[PDB]
Amino acid sequence: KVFGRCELAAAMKRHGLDNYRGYSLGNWVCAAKFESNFNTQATNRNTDGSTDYGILQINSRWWCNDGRTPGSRNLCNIPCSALLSSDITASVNCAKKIVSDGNGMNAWVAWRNRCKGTDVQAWIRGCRL
C-alpha cells in the first residue's frame, strides 16, 4: 500500500508517534516519505547483503530477521516480513526501539538528510488526526 501523508499521520498518531521521544509527528511522516516514499512494501538491498524493509526501511542486519542476513541482531525480535504489512503496527513497534537505541532518528539516513531541522510540521498540514 502507498500511504497518503495524512492517512499515515493519523495512523502514526493512533500508534503513539505524536512526539514520541521528543520527535513531533511531522518528523515521523517525513521520515516515511523519504525512506520508503510511503510504500509499505518498499525493499532495498544494501551492499552488505542486508535489506531495508517497509514504510520505515528497517534493516535486516540490526533490527529484524529476514533469514538471509548472516549475523542479524534482530533487535526488534521479529521477521522482516512482518514489517511489509499494510498495517503499520509492527513497523511502529520496532521504530520506537530504533529511535531509543543510541542515535535518535539519525538511524534514518533519509530523515537526517531531508527532514531533520526543517519545517516538518508542513508534512501534517491539513490532516485530520
Ligand SMILES: O=C(O)c1cccc(C(=O)O)n1
Ligand atoms: O494522506 C491523505 O489522505 C491526504 C493527503 C493530502 C490531501 C488529502 C485530502 O485532502 O484528503 N489527503
Ligand SMILES: O=C(O)c1cccc(C(=O)O)n1
Ligand atoms: O486520497 C485521499 O486522501 C482521499 C480520497 C477521498 C477522500 C478523502 C478524505 O476524505 O480524506 N481522502
Ligand SMILES: O=C(O)c1cccc(C(=O)O)n1
Ligand atoms: O473503532 C475504531 O475502529 C476507531 C476508533 C477511533 C479511531 C479509529 C481510527 O482512526 O482508525 N478507529
Ligand SMILES: O=C(O)c1cccc(C(=O)O)n1
Ligand atoms: O485504518 C483504520 O483503522 C480506519 C480506516 C478507515 C476508517 C476507520 C474508522 O472510522 O475507524 N479506520
Ligand SMILES: O=C(O)c1cccc(C(=O)O)n1
Ligand atoms: O484500532 C482501530 O482503529 C481498528 C481496529 C479494528 C477495526 C478497525 C476498523 O475497521 O476501522 N479499526
Ligand SMILES: O=C(O)c1cccc(C(=O)O)n1
Ligand atoms: O531524543 C533526542 O535526543 C531528541 C529528540 C528530538 C530532537 C532532538 C535534538 O534536536 O537533539 N533530540
Ligand SMILES: O=C(O)c1cccc(C(=O)O)n1
Ligand atoms: O555492524 C555494525 O553496525 C558495526 C560494526 C563495526 C563497527 C560499527 C560502527 O562503528 O558503527 N558498526
Ligand SMILES: O=C(O)c1cccc(C(=O)O)n1
Ligand atoms: O545501523 C547501524 O549501523 C547500527 C545500528 C545499531 C547499532 C550499531 C552499532 O553498534 O554499530 N549500528
Ligand SMILES: O=C(O)c1cccc(C(=O)O)n1
Ligand atoms: O557502517 C556502520 O555500521 C555505520 C555507519 C554509520 C553509522 C553507524 C552507526 O551509528 O552505528 N554505523
Ligand SMILES: O=C(O)c1cccc(C(=O)O)n1
Ligand atoms: O493546505 C491546507 O491548508 C489544508 C489542506 C486540507 C485541509 C485544510 C483544512 O481543513 O484546514 N487545510
Ligand SMILES: O=C(O)c1cccc(C(=O)O)n1
Ligand atoms: O494545517 C493546516 O490546515 C494549515 C497549516 C498552515 C496554513 C494553513 C492555511 O493557510 O490554510 N493551513
Ligand SMILES: O=C(O)c1cccc(C(=O)O)n1
Ligand atoms: O485554520 C486553517 O488551517 C484553515 C482555516 C480556514 C480555511 C482553511 C483552508 O481552506 O485550508 N484552513
Ligand SMILES: O=C(O)c1cccc(C(=O)O)n1
Ligand atoms: O484515508 C484518508 O484519506 C485519510 C485518513 C486520515 C486523514 C485524512 C486527511 O486528513 O485527508 N485522510
Ligand SMILES: [Cl-]
Ligand atoms: Cl510536526
Ligand SMILES: [Eu+2]
Ligand atoms: Eu485524505
Ligand SMILES: [Eu+2]
Ligand atoms: Eu479504525
